[PDB]
Design a protein around this ligand. Structure first.
Ligand SMILES: *[C@@H]1O[C@H](CO)[C@@H](O[C@@H]2O[C@H](CO)[C@@H](O)[C@H](O)[C@H]2NC(C)=O)[C@H](O)[C@H]1NC(C)=O
Ligand SMILES: *[C@@H]1O[C@H](CO)[C@@H](O)[C@H](O)[C@H]1NC(C)=O
Ligand SMILES: *[C@@H]1O[C@H](CO)[C@@H](O)[C@H](O)[C@H]1NC(C)=O
Lengths: 124, 50, 106
């Protein structure tokens, strides 16, 4: 199992980015995914999560309405769209994989991330 | 049977011929599990990633 | 949901019996995860469901608790265990992590 993130960089306040995370070594469409960030020298904060199908998407209130999560099951790629960034949004963003496989016709719970990516920096 | 170590050898076996085992470690833990028997002479060995 | 872990930091000698707690301020029943983040690397899952030991971490670790109080213990603190530990609930899908706790050898 392997996760690799990309798309980090430096953008002005109010800018936008196209964070991406490729997945390999497991059936991608069976597991929910979530992005979690770590501010410099701070604890982990959950940002957004998406189930396997993609019908349900959840966002934390600090990011609600500004970001947009998506996934493309055809080529095992998880995306995160950042819009109207602020100063406190700067952090290291990790893409995580849940531990519970679920059928593609189901919508379900999540929250036991067993694998994590290397993380990518985002500065504003 | 001293080298195998584990006591879970299934019944119906006959003492006197070679049985193949596997030792699986989980950190500082070691367990012996019985897998079966193999022919006396082998000509090719093949192992898959799965 | 809020989580608070005590102590914020601790230090113990090699082979000691370090114990770190976490509380949920709300009935979580059993839904708690324990992570470990070594400095500069991604976290790893140690315990899920507050007590189920993961398949790739030695039995030195243990976890217990229910409701509002939870606890993670290291039976014999080895030098490899210097890291930051976090508790994370999943009773609500807007899941939250704790503030962390750091260990130290002496
Ligand atoms: C696989 O594990 C077994 C235990 O099931 C080992 O057998 C024991 O090994 C220890 C350590 O050397 C000895 O002190 C004991 O005398 C052994 N026998 C018993 C009955 O406990 C075995 O050595 C391991 N084998 C391999 C090939 O690694
Ligand atoms: C084990 O193998 C040796 C090989 O020389 C053989 O002599 C011996 O009889 C076998 N042991 C038993 C207990 O059958
Ligand atoms: C395993 O634990 C025993 C008892 O503490 C110790 O003697 C042995 O050296 C340890 N080995 C490893 C590889 O952790």
């Amino acid at each position: 199992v392997q996760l690799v993130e990309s798309g980090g960089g430096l953008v002005q306040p109010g800018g936008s980015l196209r964070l991406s995370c490729a997945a390999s070594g497991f059936t991608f469409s069976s597991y929910a995914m979530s992005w979690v960030r770590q501010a410099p020298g701070k604890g982990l904060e959950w940002v957004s999560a998406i189930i396997g199908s993609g019908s349900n998407t959840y966002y934390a209130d600090s990011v609600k309405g500004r970001f947009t999560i998506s996934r493309d099951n055809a080529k095992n790629t998880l995306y995160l769209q950042m819009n109207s960034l602020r100063a406190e949004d700067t952090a290291v963003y990790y893409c995580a994989k849940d531990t519970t496989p679920r059928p593609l016709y189901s919508s379900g719970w999540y929250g036991s991330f067993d694998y994590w990516g290397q993380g990518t920096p985002v500065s504003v | 049977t001293l080298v195998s170590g584990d006591a879970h050898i299934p019944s119906g076996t006959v003492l006197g011929n070679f049985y193949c085992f596997v030792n699986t470690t989980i950190g500082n833990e070691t367990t012996s599990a019985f897998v079966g028997a193999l022919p006396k002479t082998v000509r090719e060995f093949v192992i898959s990633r799965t | 949901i809020q989580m608070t872990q005590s102590p914020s930091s601790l230090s113990a000698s090699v082979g000691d019996r370090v114990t770190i707690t976490c509380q949920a301020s709300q009935d979580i029943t059993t839904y708690l995860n324990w992570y470990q983040q070594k400095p500069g690397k991604a976290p790893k899952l140690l315990i899920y469901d507050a007590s189920n030991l993961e398949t790739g971490v030695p039995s030195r670790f243990s976890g217990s608790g229910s409701g509002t109080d939870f606890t993670l213990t290291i039976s014999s603190l080895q030098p490899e265990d210097i890291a930051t530990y976090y508790c994370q609930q999943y009773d609500n899908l807007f899941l939250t992590f704790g503030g962390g706790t750091k260990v130290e050898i002496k």
